Amino acid sequence: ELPNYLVTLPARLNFPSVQKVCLDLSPGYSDVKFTVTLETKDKTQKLLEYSGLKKRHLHCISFLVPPPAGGTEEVATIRVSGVGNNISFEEKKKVLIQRQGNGTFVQTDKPLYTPGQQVYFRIVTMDSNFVPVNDKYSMVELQDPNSNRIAQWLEVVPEQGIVDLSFQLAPEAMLGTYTVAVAEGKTFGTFSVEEYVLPKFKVEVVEPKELSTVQESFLVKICCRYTYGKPMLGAVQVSVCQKANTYWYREVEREQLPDKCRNLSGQTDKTGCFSAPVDMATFDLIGYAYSHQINIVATVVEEGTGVEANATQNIYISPQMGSMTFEDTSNFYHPNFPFSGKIRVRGHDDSFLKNHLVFLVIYGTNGTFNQTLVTDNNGLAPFTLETSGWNGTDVSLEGKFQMEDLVYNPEQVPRYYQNAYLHLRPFYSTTRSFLGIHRLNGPLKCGQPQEVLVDYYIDPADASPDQEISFSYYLIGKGSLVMEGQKHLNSKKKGLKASFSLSLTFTSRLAPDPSLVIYAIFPSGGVVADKIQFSVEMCFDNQVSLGFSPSQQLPGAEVELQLQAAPGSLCALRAVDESVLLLRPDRELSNRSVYGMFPFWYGHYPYQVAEYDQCTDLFSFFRDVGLKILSNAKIKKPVDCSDSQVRQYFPETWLWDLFPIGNSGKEAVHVTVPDAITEWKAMSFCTSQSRGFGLSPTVGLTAFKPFFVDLTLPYSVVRGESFRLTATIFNYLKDCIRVQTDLAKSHEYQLESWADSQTSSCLCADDAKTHHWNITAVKLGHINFTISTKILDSNEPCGGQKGFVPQKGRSDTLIKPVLVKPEGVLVEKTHSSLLCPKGKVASESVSLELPVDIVPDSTKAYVTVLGDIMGTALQNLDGLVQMPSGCGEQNMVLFAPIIYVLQYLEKAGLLTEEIRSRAVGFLEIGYQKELMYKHSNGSYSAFGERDGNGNTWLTAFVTKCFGQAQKFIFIDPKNIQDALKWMAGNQLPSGCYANVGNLLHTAMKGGVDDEVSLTAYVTAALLEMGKDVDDPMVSQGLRCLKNSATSTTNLYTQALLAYIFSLAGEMDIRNILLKQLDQQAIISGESIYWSQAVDVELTAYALLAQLTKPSLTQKEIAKATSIVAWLAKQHNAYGGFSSTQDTVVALQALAKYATTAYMPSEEINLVVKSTENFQRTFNIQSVNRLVFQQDTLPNVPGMYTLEASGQGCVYVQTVLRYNILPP
Amino acid sequence: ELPNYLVTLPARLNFPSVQKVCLDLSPGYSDVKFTVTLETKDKTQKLLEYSGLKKRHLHCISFLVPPPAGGTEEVATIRVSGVGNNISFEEKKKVLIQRQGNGTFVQTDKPLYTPGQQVYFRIVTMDSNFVPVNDKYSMVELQDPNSNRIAQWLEVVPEQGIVDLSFQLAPEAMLGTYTVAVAEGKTFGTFSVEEYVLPKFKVEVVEPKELSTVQESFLVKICCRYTYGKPMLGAVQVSVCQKANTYWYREVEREQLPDKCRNLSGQTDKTGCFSAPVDMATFDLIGYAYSHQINIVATVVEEGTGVEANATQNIYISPQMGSMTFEDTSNFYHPNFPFSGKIRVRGHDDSFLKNHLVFLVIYGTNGTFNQTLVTDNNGLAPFTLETSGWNGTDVSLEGKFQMEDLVYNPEQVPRYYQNAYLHLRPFYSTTRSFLGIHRLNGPLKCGQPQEVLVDYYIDPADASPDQEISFSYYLIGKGSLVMEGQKHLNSKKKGLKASFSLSLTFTSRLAPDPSLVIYAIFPSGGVVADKIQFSVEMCFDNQVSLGFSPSQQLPGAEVELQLQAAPGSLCALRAVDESVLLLRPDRELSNRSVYGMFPFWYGHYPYQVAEYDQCTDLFSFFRDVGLKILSNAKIKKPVDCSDSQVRQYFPETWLWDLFPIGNSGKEAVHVTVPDAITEWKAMSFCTSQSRGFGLSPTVGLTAFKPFFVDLTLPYSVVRGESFRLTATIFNYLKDCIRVQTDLAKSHEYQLESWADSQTSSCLCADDAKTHHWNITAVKLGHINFTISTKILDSNEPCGGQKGFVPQKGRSDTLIKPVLVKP
């Protein structure tokens, strides 16, 4: 016999992890010292030293990995060496050690906020094995919808992997999509802040969920239900419609047909759900001018109330009436042994079909085979096939509904049958023996031992009867070898179709789709092996479950709450209203999102250590699961080339408390239900360094009362108007009752009161009596509307019999707040100052006034201080230096911004030398990327060296890029002088732009793309490095441009021709067009910009025209400060790699503005002082520099003093909002 | 009638841990809202918002401890407030918050080094819940014994709570007790460095371990064994001696009588244990001038070699021949209900005596009572007493051997009976009921769920049959609440001596001495309770074991070491030689040492939050464990005054590695044994954040060969000076064989030709033959000395028969380095 060995490691090692390495020894050897090492550049760690035994032995050891010798990634070398008695086996492979993606998320308690609320949020960072990581954050930031950073917490440490942070939102905070970022990661937790009111009912479709083209009619069923679980009445309008399909060509036959649609009007039943049938004779399933799509817009208005809900459902019409997919089968067959599998058969309605005659056709080189099968009464079709006629050839399985396909017809869409296709490859079995694993149905549970049966046959032609046989099994989860073992079997049985069993246990360390690989090496050297995948549900380490008792309980009294988790955990709990999830769907915190933030659905070898043998077997079996194998056994295929209750409450988020789980595993807390009659959806994620991360499914506590009231009233209420206060009184008791309703009159709202002063009415079971009022308000802010109802004892009978009072819940009151705003139209007066003392005190007196037409308590004024030139995304400027390229003409516009960002960063005080070196290395390898576009004439071209003389734009761009890169690296100026002779030859002094050269990409050279702009750029490119006017090229350029300077027109071109005269330093003709430039600029507050993508370019060129010119004054300083404040919020000003030239010109405008006037703050103490001797102090040093701080001032608006002391420049913006009478 | 509440907190909160808090409520309430909250000097978190229920309910929640506003230690306050329906209950009590003690130990691979070797050491931090912390180490330092810091490490980060560091000692490093110190703290580890040679055998006493005065003559059974488990023949000289005791007055009568020594010479038997009786009347037991403490110094010399091993056994001589101690009993007793207890019965050797009539006498105000009791065949005396006639008065119990004590005599030392004395206090019981907890044996077993039987009697005069009575139980360990429960019983059973059971689980969170408190509040206002103290062995939550397979190996063959700990744990190793432990005894790394690393007085409040009266009940039951109680029930009494291989090897440690544990909880490694004929003692500890710290027993591997050699030679050799190299040959084969010996000649050393060749000889079973040579050194430094022995087949009989050649063990080649100095 020949002894063998097999060592297996993960191919992709992870740095804070503990991994396994397995080594299997044949019998024989038994005198050879085996040792395995992994060699990094820092050490040589031996994994195991070992010797052979008299039997086959599989030995697996765990190890802490070496750190990577690079920054975060290093190719280490795995080495097996067997020494001893004049033989030295040595084999050598490469593995990869990298710091894996520590995935994080941020969970706000709500996706929605009124202004004045409190944004609570938890940031969780967690490992690939769902272990929490206490890698403490540098910074976390909360930014406006204007991308302006308004909150920042620095150097924050998490407890048990999670951190909670509370930001009190402003009562005057602007409406939009706020964002929260951590450490400048890939996670941007966004929440909306807007004005909203809570809907009390959800409308949804029920029966239209699938539609096929073979149906005749479908029954639209629209169910509207309250949040507390009761049905309701109300008028229903359902718009069922198919829109016209927009074709892939958008220029011809664009005059479309109108959308085909039918509108349903109705009333819901006693179960509160309206049903009506709609034919598909209305819609055009045959026609390609209409999409295969039906929009259902269901709109329900409550009876006598006026509130409205809508459901927007999208249905995709499918001509496919049945789906047949392989789901439990292998991609490989062993030769001349039976092959097993099963087919999932489903219909159009994704339901498990019954008693279907499926037909399996087999394509092979011997002959086409056909076999029919019948599904069972569960929806599966098992099959076993005899492969002995397949002759070791790759075959094809096709499961079909019928033998004959549908003939394509003009009058009807051909209904396609989704067949079951499979390709079977012969396994590389050099020795005749068989393994097979019986697969385990659908999704498998976790924490319980799965019993898996393994079938085998060891033939007595390659294994002698004295040789003990053993099967080595590996369970691989998420690309790491997570379970190992070997089973020894008795050698006396030898040749029979036998079986044995394994007892596995799937968990969160196991994948959603993990693998089982079993193998057996014979003493002949051949191996027989089989692997299967698995369907494992998205489980977790902590078995968390949430429990309410008694789970449907009256509003205002206690409910016991159970947390089930692993002991020693710290667990976070969110109990929130249903109604706040009715407007915006919540940010999905589930098992699928936690499993989805780690991108490892592929497994496999990485790019760094991949083995390209090609110019299936056991090596492919370990390659597909992501394990490096080193062996001398025949595992490689040879390569081939081819009782009154007062009710004020907490209707928003209810529970946001942290609970550490004790040693019992379970923990209870009694919580008091808020008085809003809704459903509370609660969820919890528990985390622990012991077991891991666990996530409860969300549960619901239905707070419900039998008899109650409900006020409805809008949120956006202005003063003076009479709004519709609608009070819907609900009786859900089974007996008819009498109610008495009264609004408690106070001195804070006015009405003339239809049916007030303790009105009385009669109602009965499932009844909603809607009283109406219109109310006008006199106060401001939040004011309370209070109502009370009682069930009177019936002196007279009504509704038939005498009314009956319940013993409990006889009375019900309600207090509801509303926000009332001042009258008139709003208008803002803003004033900005750039206070820059240089080691001193700089002061400014600000005066802001108001016309005398104001209603009282309407004027508000607040001041904002900012220490930085722009809001956020300095790390975007850090990331602009990456991603080199050499394809297309986007390479020059991606290699342009490096010199600009390293000019910008050194004047901001945050320059780093390692990105300096990396960026100039990228620029030095980027100098070679413009060399194969060099023309044969001695110039550059857009594409090819034979196209012709190049365009002036690209030659001027590479002239600027070569002349502005001499401050960082060595660029020779000989190519500039080689280009200048072709600038002189291309444009005549008698006439400029003789039209030689063309760009490959259109709408790219500018916003206008005319000849005078390209001429002014190529004649402005010479003197923009620091040169004066000394050349014939710039002389003929100014000769061409001085005629157009007096011609005016097209202010973009006027600004960029004022740019070259500002480079010339002359004030004679650019001042006669400067006055018509700034007066045509529109005003957007203090963030103004010039208006004629094109406007941002015009703003950048006019900022450099106003900045490059000499004699900068303070009004020009404030004007340019307003311009760069508008450019601060432009996300297209920086962040584009294949974008236009706007990015580099706005970025060099930022660089020149940091050069000349505004340098960033490093120590500013600011004080504001008012008329009424009120003062306030801001501190802006280095980390609250970007924090855009606010302060609300209580004085009557007048003259105020704004003083800045220290070293640095600061920006102060004062905003006065007030309301004026419309006449 | 009158509703009652009870709030329980630990009285000493540790900052990185979580703590329980408990609230128990009577039937009644259901309209008030109880808030318990813990305020400190920066924040106030609401521990429980909680409305009342119509039954009795026990609700307990776990909370994170607030940070210390004082920096490391502060006095917070917990308060209870029941507000609602114009009812305002408000009470408060002070509690202490301090940072928990970070324990730290350092181990080394050996406790003893020659200069020129590598010193390894591991330093481990530890919490009071035995979980390791990866706290940032500032600096660690290594000091010469002249108080000079010779090595220095700055800014070392722990990997899974431990640090593993190495240092190369100098080849001319001077001799003394070097010290490893951490951050100028209280932790230090001393290792001695001097020249040594490894002893191959040890010697200890077997039979003399206790001396009582009633003996006539006592056996001295000295016994000497090799490290590889085999007996040895030799010459034994034992000095058994009684020293003259120095007087307490150190000013007069300096003339001292000579020490009563007896010298015994002997040869060990085939089992290698020398036994000889010594008449103990030679030693002066009566007089005070001679000490009551014998000292046995035994020196054993191997024949033909000259090496010697000494053992010093210091045995106290005691006149005590027995001990009555109370160990399973309560300090309290309930009035007019039976009281149970158990007595340990031990003799002069502290062994369990059989069939001893122990006598219980009871000292009370009604009358002194006597009772006799027969022990079982285990060593226990279980008794029960009626307390109906005791009338609620504190009593005393005394358990004795006999009624009459021994008369003091001038001619004899008065031998004392160590009786069992106890004082029983009356329980403060306002309402008549009984609650007793049955005891559980001696030291309990960790991890297994024990079953405890608790019996009770609820008197129907002070209870109502319609309402149920629920017993609340607290299983408390190491000053914090561990396990909780509320177990109800219906009062339809009425008044009887009923019983029920609890399923307890004891872990490392629970103490070596944890407590169990069971109580109940009746609606009259009274309370009934019982507290017992358990006894658990010094346990760890991480159960770790080591196994060598096949646990006895010839040198040169691999051995599978199996290491069994929790998954996700990082484990140390130490496979030291036994011969290293024979020179310097190891500093103790055991469960006693780890549990004694932390102060374990406990059972009381801190002095900053202590409560005292002007001058037992449930409040004393919670004081004696150290828990704060806020209650309005009758919980306080009214105030009153109170074949051929060459053997070069590893005479240092064999295994010193870090093996993390995978998910199966098992690890294994085939480790190659070193080529010394010895025993390797291996021990490991594992640190995990999940299951904490775990420490394994010291398992042993006997690396043994049947036929081998050994070289006796000193460490230091003066160059140009002759020494005696003594090579001994051991035959442990069962037959008689013929050996042949060749000492390798080289230019590194010179020989004087003493039995140069033809040293072939006959060695029978369990035999040793020593050959001496006169060898001098010629060159400086380390010198190899090589000996090769083999078995030759010859027709010349050895012992009357031809020497049978082995199949394994035919030859043995040994290489020993030696140090040569000028």
Swiss-Prot record, chain A:
It is found in: Secreted. Glycans are attached at N102, N263, N391, N774, N937. Disulfide bonds join C22-C60, C223-C273, C241-C261, C446-C539, C571-C686, C736-C764, C762-C798, C836-C1209, C992-C1040. Changing R918W: May be a risk factor for otitis media. In the epidermis, expressed predominantly in the granular layer at the apical edge of keratinocytes (at protein level). Also detected in placenta, testis and thymus but not in epithelia of kidney, lung, small intestine or colon. GO terms for biological process: regulation of endopeptidase activity. Keywords: Bait region, Disulfide bond, Glycoprotein, Protease inhibitor, Secreted, Serine protease inhibitor, Signal, Thioester bond. There is a cross-link at C887-Q890 (Isoglutamyl cysteine thioester (Cys-Gln)). Its main location: secreted. One of its GO terms (cellular component) is extracellular exosome. GO terms for molecular function: peptidase inhibitor activity; serine-type endopeptidase inhibitor activity. Is able to inhibit all four classes of proteinases by a unique 'trapping' mechanism. This protein has a peptide stretch, called the 'bait region' which contains specific cleavage sites for different proteinases. When a proteinase cleaves the bait region, a conformational change is induced in the protein which traps the proteinase. The entrapped enzyme remains active against low molecular weight substrates (activity against high molecular weight substrates is greatly reduced). Belongs to the protease inhibitor I39 (alpha-2-macroglobulin) family. Monomer. It is linked to Otitis media: An inflammation of the middle ear resulting in earache, fever, hearing disturbance, and vertigo. This is Alpha-2-macroglobulin-like protein 1. It comes from Homo sapiens.
Curated annotation (Swiss-Prot), chain B:
The keyword Secreted applies. It comes from the Eukaryota. In the epidermis, expressed predominantly in the granular layer at the apical edge of keratinocytes (at protein level). Also detected in placenta, testis and thymus but not in epithelia of kidney, lung, small intestine or colon. One of its GO terms (molecular function) is peptidase inhibitor activity. Glycans are attached at N102, N263, N391, N774. It is found in: Secreted. One of its GO terms (cellular component) is extracellular space. Disulfide bonds join C22-C60, C223-C273, C241-C261, C446-C539, C571-C686, C736-C764, C762-C798. GO terms for biological process: regulation of endopeptidase activity. Keywords: Bait region, Disulfide bond, Glycoprotein, Protease inhibitor, Secreted, Serine protease inhibitor, Signal, Thioester bond. Belongs to the protease inhibitor I39 (alpha-2-macroglobulin) family. It is linked to Otitis media: An inflammation of the middle ear resulting in earache, fever, hearing disturbance, and vertigo. Monomer. Is able to inhibit all four classes of proteinases by a unique 'trapping' mechanism. This protein has a peptide stretch, called the 'bait region' which contains specific cleavage sites for different proteinases. When a proteinase cleaves the bait region, a conformational change is induced in the protein which traps the proteinase. The entrapped enzyme remains active against low molecular weight substrates (activity against high molecular weight substrates is greatly reduced). This is Alpha-2-macroglobulin-like protein 1. It comes from Homo sapiens. The lineage of its organism: Eukaryota, Metazoa, Chordata, Craniata, Vertebrata. The chain holds residues 19 to 905 of 1454 of the full protein.
